[PDB]
Amino acid sequence: LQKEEEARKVKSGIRQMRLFSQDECAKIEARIDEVVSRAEKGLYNEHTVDRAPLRNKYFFGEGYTYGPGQERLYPPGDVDEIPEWVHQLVIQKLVEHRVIPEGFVNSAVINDYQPGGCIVSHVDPIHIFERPIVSVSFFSDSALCFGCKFQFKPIRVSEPVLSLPVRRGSVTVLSGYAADEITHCIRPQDIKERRAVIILRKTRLDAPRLE
């Protein structure tokens, strides 16, 4: 009853919509490849690009470091600016369809996942970002899990509280319980081929920031 209770609460904090056509996804995917190519040309600030074995993260607008839960924003202007293509192909669409207000987004993060890549249980850092958190999926379909104890106590529990499909061209909006009161993660098994995501957020005015 506790897990079936949680699932409904999680769903209260999730809104999803298919906003980007296949043609729109293809253009955005070409732009994501341009970013990856620029990074490999050493064209971005050091704090803009975080390379890890099965995921690269690209920080535009604002970036942060990641004891525990002591993430801090970099000083303003440390990471590269949000590309014009993010503003005009992605943010503009979200603003037009009333997902978030004009002027809300000042952070765009691109996560580019290898096959087998994943996200280990985490909560979007509530001391750094406002809600809602907006995620847009590219390249391939995947699944976003909520309630990720199964990643750490496998003998005791094997399944997430909820598994949410996240398809190519889908916009996921997280707020409330889904953003603040439960962990999420991505299982290696749900990233069988390259998948990328663009995360659009608003940093808090009072967010802790390195000087």
Side-chain angles (χ1 to χ4, degrees), residues 6-7 9-10 12-17 19-21 23-26 28-148 150-155 157-158 160-191 193-211:
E6 280 178 351
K9 284 157 173 269
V10 171
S12 73
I14 290 170
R15 295 300 182 275
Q16 286 204 297
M17 59 223 83
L19 246 47
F20 299 84
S21 69
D23 280 354
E24 290 166 328
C25 285
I28 286 161
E29 286 152 11
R31 295 300 196 151
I32 291 171
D33 289 338
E34 171 208 325
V35 169
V36 176
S37 172
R38 295 185 63 87
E40 186 77 3
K41 299 179 183 168
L43 297 183
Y44 289 133
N45 304 343
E46 176 213 325
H47 290 148
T48 300
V49 183
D50 177 287
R51 308 181 181 84
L54 298 180
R55 190 267 291 122
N56 281 12
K57 180 179 289 288
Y58 305 93
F59 283 105
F60 298 109
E62 297 287 357
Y64 60 87
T65 60
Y66 55 91
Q70 293 294 292
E71 292 80 5
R72 296 284 175 270
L73 284 173
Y74 294 116
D78 221 58
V79 305
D80 287 76
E81 69 183 338
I82 297 172
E84 295 183 359
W85 75 260
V86 179
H87 285 298
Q88 304 173 35
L89 301 186
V90 189
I91 299 168
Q92 179 165 1
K93 176 83 81 178
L94 304 169
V95 173
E96 273 161 8
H97 291 253
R98 301 282 171 280
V99 178
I100 29 89
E102 176 63 24
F104 178 92
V105 180
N106 75 332
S107 173
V109 171
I110 302 180
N111 296 323
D112 191 2
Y113 296 97
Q114 300 280 346
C118 78
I119 299 178
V120 167
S121 170
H122 76 113
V123 182
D124 188 280
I126 201 173
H127 74 285
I128 302 297
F129 299 112
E130 306 273 14
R131 279 58 178 129
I133 298 135
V134 183
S135 297
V136 198
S137 289
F138 297 96
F139 293 113
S140 60
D141 297 353
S142 188
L144 185 59
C145 289
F146 293 82
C148 294
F150 76 96
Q151 293 188 320
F152 298 90
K153 303 285 164 166
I155 285 174
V157 65
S158 273
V161 168
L162 174 151
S163 174
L164 174 78
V166 287
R167 304 197 174 85
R168 180 189 185 223
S170 66
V171 177
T172 301
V173 187
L174 303 185
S175 64
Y177 193 101
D180 298 345
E181 286 172 85
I182 198 166
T183 62
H184 61 266
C185 62
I186 289 185
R187 301 192 258 205
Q189 71 192 62
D190 289 313
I191 301 192
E193 59 185 89
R194 183 192 185 179
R195 189 244 176 181
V197 74
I198 303 175
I199 319 296
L200 295 323
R201 285 167 304 194
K202 177 176 168 56
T203 60
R204 307 174 58 83
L205 203 54
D206 64 11
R209 194 176 285 262
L210 313 180
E211 289 190 68

